[PDB]
Design a protein around this ligand. Structure first.
Ligand SMILES: [Zn+2]
Ligand SMILES: [Zn+2]
Lengths: 250, 238
């Protein structure tokens, strides 16, 4: 029970990573799908300000302010610096519902800027935004600071979410313990990435587990086939995907 | 003739009445669930202004403007005059995304104010609201019978409110009542009004493994009345 999410091209995208109690993006539906689980979120990291990536936030905050009782800690929301939609939306919520003014706080983030989560199991955990490949979009890394000569520290990439983007350069992805990569087009684009393009970076980076999301509803029937295909062309890499028609769970 | 909806107390509630291309209330997920069907919407009537009744509007209006052409027809949105949330949300939508500025229009309604739908089959239909600042709605068609014109209640929808006075529901071909208003409160009014078919909604997830039998026991005390309910755990179709 590590990840539960939903992704549909232009309708809604939200991915809940529970180990660190983080919600990445918040398309409409999230609060309705997870009911009381929304009480467990400690952070929401927005990849972009489009509708289908933040409209579900209002429901998350409302449900939490209703059922967490007097014992409710504010929800921290991060989004890329300079996103007018997030600012206005967040301002609208408080304005519209004054009883929500304290239910959450928002925080602008700049590229490469770390955010310290907590210290557990002997390690410090951080989330860090990297710009995706106009409109500032962010992808995110969740890493642990570890020590492999005082000793030598290093970042252990526990998770990497791409957000809307093209196949990320293997360098940004090398070392991920779990890659959640967008995979809109199964071939010819209109910018979003094509699967051929994503799997290539995967190989170059030697990543062994990948979750493909934000799939076009059309590629459906063809999808279930392309994966079985790829899964066999890279027999050491675990490839999973979020079907545009169902809540994804792992 | 055809209905697809979803209702879960506090989370989301939206009901699409296909016959007259009307969406009643717009909680989150509506556009995700209906996909392209949202292009067919002609009207949206809001019963109230809480989050779970309107937060899905933004998706509805964004999906349409993206998939509907130039001459695109603006979606008309009516709400109970006086609900700051709806105007503020609407304004937020248009400001944050100007491309949607003319994609739809919002109109406040006072209790009793009629809204004209269209004219087909030799009849006109209208939607008219009634208090319960929440609103419920009636979809009536004007027919002449003597030559005395009369209003036929094709549909009645309550919205967050208690059982309705059987006179307000008198002679409706279909009653959609919120059932969190106690069932008896509603059913008694039903048996009183003479209504033959009713769908309950806005039910708690808490009384699912208990409500079942209730409707079963009721469909027996009123073997002539059809009692349908919306399972807050899944989409409802009819
Ligand atoms: Zn998108
Ligand atoms: Zn409610």
């Amino acid at each position: 029970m590590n990840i539960i999410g939903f992704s549909k091209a232009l309708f809604s995208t939200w991915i809940y990573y529970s180990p660190e109690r983080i919600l990445f993006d918040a398309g409409e539906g999230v609060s309705t799908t997870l009911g009381s689980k929304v009480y467990a979120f400690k952070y929401v990291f927005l990849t972009h300000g489009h509708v289908d990536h933040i409209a579900g936030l209002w429901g998350v905050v409302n449900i939490r302010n209703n059922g967490m009782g007097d014992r409710e800690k504010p929800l921290d929301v991060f989004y890329p610096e300079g996103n007018r939609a997030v600012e206005e939306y967040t301002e609208f919520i408080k304005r519209a519902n004054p009883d929500l003014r304290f239910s959450f706080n928002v925080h602008p983030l700049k590229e490469g800027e770390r955010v310290f989560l907590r210290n557990a199991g002997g390690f410090k955990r951080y989330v860090q935004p990297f710009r995706t490949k106009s409109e500032v979009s962010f992808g995110y890394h969740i890493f642990e600071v570890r020590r492999k000569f005082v000793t030598e520290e290093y970042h252990k990439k526990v998770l990497t979410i791409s957000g809307d983007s093209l196949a990320l350069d293997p360098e940004e992805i090398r070392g991920t313990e779990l890659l959640i990569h967008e995979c809109t087009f199964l071939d010819a684009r209109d910018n979003h990435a094509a699967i051929d393009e994503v799997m290539e970076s995967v190989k170059a980076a030697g990543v062994k587990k990948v979750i493909l999301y934000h799939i076009s509803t059309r590629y459906i029937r063809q999808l279930k086939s392309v994966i079985k295909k790829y899964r066999e062309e890279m027999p050491d890499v675990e490839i999973l995907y979020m079907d545009p028609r169902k809540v994804f769970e792992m």
